[PDB]
Amino acid sequence: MLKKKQLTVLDLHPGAGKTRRVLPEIVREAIKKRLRTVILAPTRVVAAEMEEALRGLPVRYMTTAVNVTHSGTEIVDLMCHATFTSRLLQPIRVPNYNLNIMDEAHFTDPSSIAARGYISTRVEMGEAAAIFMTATPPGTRDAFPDSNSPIMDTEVEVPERAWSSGFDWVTDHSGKTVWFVPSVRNGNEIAACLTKAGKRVIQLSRKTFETEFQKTKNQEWDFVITTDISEMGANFKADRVIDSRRCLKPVILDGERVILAGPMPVTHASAAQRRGRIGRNPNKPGDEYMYGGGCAETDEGHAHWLEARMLLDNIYLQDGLIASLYRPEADKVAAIEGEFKLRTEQRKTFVELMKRGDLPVWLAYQVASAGITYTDRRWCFDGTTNNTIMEDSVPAEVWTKYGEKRVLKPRWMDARVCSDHAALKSFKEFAAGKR
């Protein structure tokens, strides 16, 4: 696998031991051959699991998720997918890694797509080797891959709202259930309904993931209610998955706003990863997978692929050359390489709106490309009346940095800045000049 000019897709089934058995073997071989190597973890949780699998090997952990004293003699670096892309965008030297290893390489967050595009472009150039580790590479059509033990697959109507009757099979279960919901808000309603029925419920989402995931290890629980983030190598001691088979899809309308469309069907890859949370123990056959809809290729026209092009347009490769998306995912967006390339000062604004601002890529781009500077928040208040952000059926209000109470009315509306209470709170703080 380790010869230059090669990209290898390690597509062993979920639970086959890619992370705990194959990855340490690859790393040992890489060190033997003096390959400067990066290992990309999708999350801080997986980064910590990798440290356990790699413990004893000279690996530099570029994450505060691991508390290790580095020797200074490591040629293998480990960081999150997002950290890799972030360091590429920033005015900081990223080594030209000979070997690029991406774990959970199916991750469809913009920074992961961008990292695959950059890595696969370096391999196509003949400059590097890469290994993408995933049961479900782009365009996979099999929602029902092999497992370590037989799974009971049942198509069933799954609740997406509180219920009083008609779903006894949900609560009548005495094991542990991982339940994939399309959104935080939908999970909150299911979680309240299960809590009222006497169940112990943990909720996971992107913003709460590291903190709340620890509860699945430290306390007894009956249900984990999770968004799609648990597709990215989160492991549970569970005997059932309940899968809505639904997700939200960010969509750019008319080049001018972003909506969260759906809920709508998940991809085959997502369905296989959700299912793949169970059937992992060869000694425990008959884990159950209850699924509430079909799959569709809802990654086509999804904003994350256009966002990935915005990031790649702003990463230096060589002179004016721009990295392509990884070929199997390159048709998910109608975009021209270079269309989003910013001049030096606008690019810095774009980076800071994402890194410090915590704005979605698309929104960061609109503000930066309009020639607005990072601390200038006038745009949060001067949109049309129909861009008014609503909080519990009333216009959201903040005190501006000037001490004026104003209605939150952004010039560009991205539904992700108000998708749940936590998002809207963060965006209000941003509009107020608090970061």
The size of the interface with ligand UR4 (CB under 6 A), counted in residues, is 8
Please enumerate, by residue number, every residue annotated as part of a binding site: 12-19
Q: How far apart are CA 140 and CA 142, in angstroms?
A: 6
Among positions 58, 139, 292, 293, the unique one binding ligand UR4 when judged by CB under 6 A: 293
* 68 vs 296 by CB, closer to ligand UR4: 296
- Measured from the CB atom, the residue of 30 and 260 that comes closer to ligand UR4 is 260
Name the residue with the smallest CB distance to ligand UR4: 294
The least CB distance from residue 373 to ligand UR4, in Å, is 37
Determine, following the binding rule CB under 6 A, whether residue 415 of this chain makes contact with ligand UR4.
no
Please say which residue, 261 or 432, places its beta carbon nearer to ligand UR4. 261
Least separation, in Å, of the C-beta of 298 and ligand UR4? 6
Stretch that binds ligand UR4, among 17-25, 134-142, 292-300, 303-311 (CB under 6 A): 292-300
Taking the complex as a whole, the smallest distance from the CB of residue 415 to ligand UR4 amounts, in Å, to 14
Residue range at the interface with ligand UR4 (CB under 6 A); choices 43-51, 198-206, 256-264, 302-310: 256-264
Tell me the two tokens of residue 72: 């200074």
Q: Which is nearer to ligand UR4, 298 or 346 (CB)?
A: 298
Radius of gyration of the chain (CA): 22
Q: How far is the CB of 267 from ligand UR4 (least distance, A)?
A: 11
Q: Within 10 A of 226 (CB to CB), how many other CB atoms are there?
A: 28
**Least gap, CB of 216 to ligand UR4 (angstroms):** 30
By CB under 6 A, what part of segment 257-276 binds ligand UR4? 261-262, 264-265
Give the one residue of 95, 175, 285, 294 binding ligand UR4; rule: CB under 6 A: 294
Least Å distance, CB 249 to ligand UR4, is 7
Report the nearest approach of ligand UR4 to the CB of residue 227 (Å): 17
Q: Which stretch binds ligand UR4 (CB under 6 A): 121-129, 162-170, 289-297, 377-385?
A: 289-297
CB nearer to ligand UR4: give 19 or 227: 227
| Minimum distance, C-beta of residue 295 to ligand UR4, in the bound complex (Å) | 7
Angular region, 245: left φ>0, alpha ψ -120 to 50, beta rest: left
Reference 414, options 380, 382, 385; nearest CA is: 380
137 burial (CB, 10 Å; 0-12 / 13-18 / 19+) is middle
Q: Which is nearer to ligand UR4, 53 or 259 (CB)?
A: 259
> What is the largest distance, in Å, between two alpha-carbon atoms of the chain?
64
Give min distance, CB of 23 to ligand UR4, in A.
35
Residue type, 139: G
Task: Report the nearest approach of ligand UR4 to the CB of residue 143 (Å).
Answer: 11
From 154, 194, 196, 155, select the one nearest 177 (Cα to Cα).
194
CA 252, CA 273: separation in Å to the nearest integer? 26
Q: Per CB under 6 A, which region of 11-19, 167-175, 201-209, 293-301 contacts ligand UR4?
A: 293-301
Nearest to ligand UR4 of 264, 423 (CB atom): 264
Q: Residue ranges for the binding site for ATP?
A: 12-19
> Nearer to ligand UR4 by C-beta: 271 or 322?
271
Q: Cβ distance 113 to 329 under 8 Å? A: yes
Nearer to ligand UR4, 52 or 155 (CB): 155
| Contacting residue, 9, 125, 253, 296, with ligand UR4 by CB under 6 A | 296
Nearest residue (CB) to ligand UR4, 157 versus 382: 157
For the chain, the residue count is 435
Question: Applying CB under 6 A, which residues contact ligand UR4?
Answer: 261-262, 264-265, 293-294, 296, 298
